[PDB]
C-alpha cells in the first residue's frame, strides 16, 4: 500500500496548504520551516525532503509534501530516515 495513509495525508494537506500552495506545489521555503519545526536536524529534513521531492525542483506538492510529513513525524517518535525513496511511497505519476 502507500506508506502514507488517508488520515495522515489529511494532516499533511493542512500543513501543505498552511504555507499557501501554488498550482499544487510548496517551495522548500514553506517546507524547510515545516521540517525545521519537527525539532529534527537538517540531516533528517535533507533526507525527508529529498525522498519527499518527487520532482526534485525545490518544491513539495500535496503528494510530495505528504511523503515528507510522515517522514518527519515518524523521525521523531518512530525511527531514523534513510535516503532511499521506498517504492511503497512513490506516486505512479513519477513513472
Amino acid at each position: 500500500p502507500w506508506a502514507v495513509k488517508p488520515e495522515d495525508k489529511a494532516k499533511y494537506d493542512a500543513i501543505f496548504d498552511s504555507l499557501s500552495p501554488v498550482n499544487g506545489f510548496l517551495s522548500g521555503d514553506k517546507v524547510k520551516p515545516v521540517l525545521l519545526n519537527s525539532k529534527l536536524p537538517v540531516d533528517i529534513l535533507g533526507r525527508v525532503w529529498e525522498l519527499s521531492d518527487i520532482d526534485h525542483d525545490g518544491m513539495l506538492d500535496r503528494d510530495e509534501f505528504a511523503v515528507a510529513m510522515f517522514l518527519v513525524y515518524c523521525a521523531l517518535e518512530k525511527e531514523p530516515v534513510p535516503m532511499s525513496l521506498p517504492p511503497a511511497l512513490v506516486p505512479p505519476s513519477k513513472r
Binding site: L35, V42, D43, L45, G46, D57, G58
Partner: peptide
Amino acid sequence: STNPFL
C-alpha cells in the same frame, strides 16, 4: 537547487 537542507 532542490533541497533546502543540503
